[PDB]
Amino acid sequence: GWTLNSAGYLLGPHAVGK
């Protein structure tokens, strides 16, 4: 992502990171 997918939405299809 860039703003809505990186800063707005969370990423992690296989690897988790909180």
Curated annotation (Swiss-Prot):
Where, if anywhere, are coiled coils annotated?
A: none
Q: What is the name of this protein?
A: Galanin
Q: Which residues of the full protein are shown?
A: 33 to 50 of 123
